[PDB]
Symmetry: D2
Subunit: 348 residues, 4 copies
């Protein structure tokens, strides 16, 4: 009396099976769900005009990379791309299927300031979400992503209680709606690196946020077995002149997770934030030298997989082979890092 109705065994099985496929050993996620605007920025850094045609060429360049599925279990898409065709006319989802890569879809509607906070953000998107999920499933998506953002600012008391409460509520609602529609939800509570705080401050805040997030997931009847977490690694703030060592980042990151995340969750797929391609790989590798772990520790990387690919492509289609080569180099690096085998390229 008063508890959650039981989830459909058939639905739960599909979700858990797909979450484990996504969190497969030696593999991770390619985050290619840059919005129309976010991608304008990238394309600018190489002097390419943000036409549909160019976005389609580039997503094709990414997803038609031969052998990518050896290292990439899933790809997060923007809505445009989920329903797009490559220049050659092949649906993007069909390129993914041919490599055995699972399509995923970004489903949040972005950020809005919480009234009477100092620019702290709510994530919007619950309205119509259930119906969007149904359509996206029919289109071939099997997982979803919703990004929430928090800031650290000791002087301003950020993240405030209202920020944390809102982030947790939105994530939990989103996750339960996804699971009702047969999509594995990636739960992304990103604590931004902005500021001059120490790694120990990041650790404290991450622990408080994740404790709140997982309590809310429980309150909303979210099946952990069919969900994934996409958190920040625990690091110094980005205004620190010294970056924390890989050993330190690995230690505090793993500690923060083991202190808060129940082990029924199958996978933790880190965001890379502002990290270099090489740091993102080495930090993950260092965590998986500390293994074995109670959940898979892996990656969901955008820039950390794409930065060099883009710089090599330059908008020039004859640079397509070289660009896919460097994507593969980074996919391989991060797949090896998942296993603690990348060769380069206790505090309570």
């Amino acid at each position: 009396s008063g508890y959650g109705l039981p989830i459909s065994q058939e639905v739960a099985k599909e979700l858990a099976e797909n979450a484990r496929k996504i969190a497969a050993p030696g593999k991770g996620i390619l985050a290619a769900d840059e919005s129309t605007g976010t991608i304008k920025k990238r394309f600018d850094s190489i002097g390419v005009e943000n036409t549909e045609a160019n976005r389609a060429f580039y997503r094709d360049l990414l997803f038609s990379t031969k052998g990518l599925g050896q290292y990439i279990s899933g790809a997060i898409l923007f809505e445009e791309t989920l329903y797009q065709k490559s220049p050659s006319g092949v649906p993007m989802v069909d390129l993914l299927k041919a490599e055995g890569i699972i399509p995923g879809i970004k489903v949040d509607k972005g950020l809005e300031t919480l009234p009477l906070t100092d620019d702290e953000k709510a994530t919007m998107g619950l309205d119509g979400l259930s119906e969007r999920c149904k359509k996206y499933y029919e289109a071939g998506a099997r997982f979803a992503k919703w990004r929430a953002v928090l800031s650290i600012d000791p002087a301003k008391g950020k993240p405030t209680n209202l920020s944390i409460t809102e982030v947790a509520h939105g994530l939990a609602r989103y996750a339960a709606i996804c699971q009702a529609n047969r999509l594995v939800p990636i739960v992304e509570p990103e604590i931004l690196t902005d500021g001059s705080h120490d790694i120990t401050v990041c650790a404290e805040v991450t622990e408080r946020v994740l404790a709140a997030v997982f309590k809310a997931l429980n309150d909303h009847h979210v099946l952990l077995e069919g969900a994934l977490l996409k958190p920040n690694m625990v690091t110094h703030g980005s205004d620190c002149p010294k970056p924390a060592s890989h050993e330190e980042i690995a230690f505090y990151t793993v500690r923060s997770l083991k202190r808060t995340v129940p082990p029924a969750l199958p996978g933790v797929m880190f965001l890379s934030g502002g990290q270099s391609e090489e740091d993102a790989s080495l930090n993950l590798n260092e965590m998986n030298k500390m293994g074995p772990h109670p959940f898979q520790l892996s990656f969901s990387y955008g820039r950390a997989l794409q930065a060099s690919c883009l710089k090599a492509w330059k908008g020039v289609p004859e640079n397509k082979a070289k660009a896919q080569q460097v994507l593969m180099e980074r996919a391989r690096a991060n797949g090896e890092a998942q296993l603690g085998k990348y060769g380069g390229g206790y505090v309570y």
Copy 2:
């Protein structure tokens, strides 16, 4: 450090002044915000076809009633009506302004089941809400309404914790967004009368829900001075063969409010739910014989103001004068009831 930024004094003053105008002595709200579909039902009960033209005729019939503003402080509109013209071509908002009635706008997007509950409902509508509020203010609205719904079912543990938490969260977010856009939010947590429960059960549940709602309003930095509450009266369930006496309903309703509602809130504008026109008036009157109170106890009635008006109109335009006469009779009854002067027509 970590508290709500202070609200603009200029914005707060406008909100508080408008909330007090709405909760004016001897006056209340006419709820005329029936959706396209909800109004189909009413129109059916008198054999009228739900054309735009008929909706416009009827809303015109309501709002052009001469002298209505003696008893009606505000009118909640559906979006269609806010931007509609009367048959004669006069904007609906201009009919309201001529009587000195403040226009209000329904801003929720209706109900959706919470995953893995027994059909318990979340209220949707936060996405785009801030931008809608801006447009609605420019169109002449000065207050808003968002309806959440809860059910009593002892056998099923309803309302569940998740239901109450969701209702409170949605209301608090909605209220803070309204106030950021210069709209007075009406906070409507409606506990449905469905079921066979006693009035004392309704009292317990209402108290728990309102305690949760007002804690969440505080958490979200909602200005009580510039808000209104629209709760159910406390009554027996609708499957009870005996309705509670007016004295009983008045006693438990006032008790539930005084136990939970801080007195900085200017007004409590009751919904009538399924009550007869006469019960709705007599119940309010009985509460205001128990005065004076720490907040204004008044009405926000739809059917309880319109039922006879509609039955008298019948779709026939020559019945327009008679229909407006009975609307006035009910507006007067409820204005007098607000004052505890309607003449008919302690337990811990």
Copy 3:
């Protein structure tokens, strides 16, 4: 199913009747519950040795003051005094009864630091409390007092979430246990004036704390009708060179209460903290010029009633008449202030 069992009507009636007697117009509480140690301090300020005999002489001096019950509704006692005799051999409780003053009893066991906080305090005393309440009732007490303490320090994030949560939990448990044993609980969440913060900061913190306290009282099934609140007034911090004006203190204090305290509570009996005898009276008077209010605004004063009495007594028993004269002068001042009739001696 799952709600609080109903309180005994007979018990509830007694509690509500006694709370209203305590919060009687033109009257307030004399706080004379200084512990053995706290009183050592006072006695030191006039060169008196803290013998039992002297404590008994002084409490006798206080409670045998002729006509004190005109202005004093109740007296909070320390346990020693509840079971003590005057030098002449008359039980202290019998001196109170002769003036029609209701005996009350301090029941907390003092403060202990919350582990891993910066010296933030839990209030101890729940163990054996129910049994102590029974004994104290048999001894003649009809109300109780439990003091919790919070600090403001923006730089340290005080009061922290853990501090507020603990204060609210302890107060709510204590209050429900009192009411189960026929004692009216005085709920005292004291926010200390320590620091250099502005009155607006005190207002914000007081509102957050009281919102949390009253939510917890509701959660624990506390009957507001049979309880009293003893909060700090809202003021500048004690390290401010300029004290806030009486008008300001009255405005923010009343505002903070109306924003958080449900009006079923019969009385708010302010603590005076470090205020002068005259400020404590003038601040209360100023609040009751702003009346009428939804609850009685009155006093529960220790030093603000006793400071001059003590200075006049000096330990010399021939100074007993003069000492009782000045106690009466202050009792009268504060009784008149309760009515907004003491003659001296909107921001959102």
Copy 4:
């Protein structure tokens, strides 16, 4: 700003080292902390008079069992026993030390009904706890135990929100106080088997309770690395005519833990409740066939280790050797079960 002060590294290290020693592979806890009264019952079942002398004989019989430390990592004592001598005059703690068994101490003060609940229980004992912990550490204890109790009753909505909130608060305060005094806290939220509910109902309730408990531990800055959990196994209610199979009990128990318990916790030491000696062993064994796990799954058994020992002793001192033999048989069975090697004697 506003977070927990960091725990002493030296204190944390001791706690984590001792918790891991207690949760050692192939070992578990002997719960011998029966109060004066609880032990009267046991002694009655074999016609022994509850003298101090007999309690001392029996605790001596238990703790002087040769080779017990092969299977027993720790022993929970009642306060009497911690400061007691064996008949031969050897301190009980010295018998434990000789086998390398760590002494632990029960520190709660038992149960009291929460006002206006249907006999739902708060655990008392926080007052003086910090000072008791200091004394107990000096006496040789290195871990503590605090028992909270919850009931399942769907018809009554048990466990109610107030019950769960209280249990979590008391456990978290107790745990943080222990850790401040260098004692490893065993966190025991026992959900009683009373009633006719299914194992799936027990699973739901256990998950809700543990989610609340671990959120509160986080809120109170409890170091999971230096704590232990002592939960009920997940089973049918005791009024069920069919007991769940060992495979079922193992499945739902492990599931409930992996869904709620962060893996930084070193050990889960089950209580046996009303289970037979053999069921308690077989259920644990079945869980550790499902290994390896993210935390040690082991035992903290009273009756399940002592029932036969007592029946064999009978109060007769010549039966002492036989009694210790059967204690050893059960210690061995449960040590082997910890390893998934006892030989007898997915649903979402």
